């Protein structure tokens, strides 16, 4: 299945 690094790739793309 899927999210593991998903929305991780497009958390990545963060401000954190």
Known sequence: ????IWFQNRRMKWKK
């Not at 299945?1 to 593991?4: D, H, L, N």
């Open 1 to 4: 299945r899927q999210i593991k």
